[PDB]
């Protein structure tokens, strides 16, 4: 990811305000509801029959925190996304058989949740910075 020092500062500043316990469950939860085929991969999590069931599912919330933390690791090692997400890439490809396009979907859902949380503070220049980060992570997982 090619980010200018100003973009890194803006991205890091807002990420420090992120409710890490909540934002991850909302992003993953919304992935499963907005793109319902993704529920197939998380059938071990149990009841995913309704929106209220998904968002209230403690295993969706628990796993969402893992995904956010994965993104937090990505904010470090921005010049080496391929190497850091290599172990996760192999998991999602070889064991889970997740299609690359879905990584972009979750990335875009996280951005919608960030806008939902921060509102007017999630300005267009800030979003543009996060789009590069989520695109970088998606590509890294697809590598």
């Amino acid at each position: 990811v090619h980010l200018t020092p100003e973009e890194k500062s803006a991205v890091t500043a807002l990420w420090g305000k992120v409710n890490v316990d909540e934002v991850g469950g909302e992003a993953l939860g919304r992935l499963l509801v907005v793109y319902p085929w993704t529920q197939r991969f998380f059938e071990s999590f149990g009841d995913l029959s309704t929106p209220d069931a998904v968002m209230g599912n403690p295993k969706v919330k628990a796993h969402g925190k893992k995904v956010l933390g994965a993104f937090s690791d990505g904010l470090a090692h921005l010049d080496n996304l391929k190497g850091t997400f290599a172990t996760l890439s192999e998991l999602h490809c070889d064991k889970l058989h997740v299609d690359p396009e879905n990584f972009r979907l979750l990335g875009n859902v996280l951005v919608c949740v960030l806008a939902h949380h921060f509102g007017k503070e999630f300005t267009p220049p800030v979003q543009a910075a996060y789009q590069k980060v989520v695109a970088g992570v998606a590509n890294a997982l697809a590598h």
Binding site: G29, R30, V33, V34, P36, P51, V54, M55, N108, V111, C112, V113, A115, H116, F118, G119, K120, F122, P124, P125, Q127, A128, Q131
Partner: protein
């Protein structure tokens, strides 16, 4: 393909946008041009600086067209016929660009109407925008 629930979600949510539809349309475009600079090649005739009078004006036309599309969601091909002519026949816009504007619209709606932007509503709006995109990008 929208469910009756999807149609209702979109209509009810869009009604709460109201007079600020042109403001969100403008903001969604601003976000698209900044986030995805390859989309700027479609507007070389525009001054693509921030707070552009053309971008603000265009946002209102885009919002009014989305409003029209929501009001005729049951039969969008007939309602958006001239718009399909523009985007599919004349402009030949790549469908990838519609996904980008759609995402930017969702980002804008989430930021300005957080109470309305529930998971269920999110789902229906994404589905609606995908149907609008297919219509505008198809020669029929």
């Amino acid at each position: 393909v929208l469910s009756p629930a999807d149609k209702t979600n979109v209509k009810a949510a869009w009604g709460k946008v109201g007079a600020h539809a042109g403001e969100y349309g403008a903001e969604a475009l601003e976000r698209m041009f900044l986030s995805f600079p390859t989309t700027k090649t479609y507007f070389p005739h525009f001054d693509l600086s921030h707070g552009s009078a053309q971008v603000k004006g265009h946002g209102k036309k885009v919002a009014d067209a989305l409003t029209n599309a929501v009001a005729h969601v049951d039969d969008m091909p007939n309602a958006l016929s001239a718009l399909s002519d523009l985007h599919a026949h004349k402009l030949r816009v790549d469908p990838v660009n519609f996904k980008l504007l759609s995402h930017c619209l969702l980002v804008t709606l989430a930021a300005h109407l957080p109470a309305e932007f529930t998971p269920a509503v999110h789902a229906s709006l994404d589905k609606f925008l995908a149907s609008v995109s297919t219509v505008l990008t198809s020669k029929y």
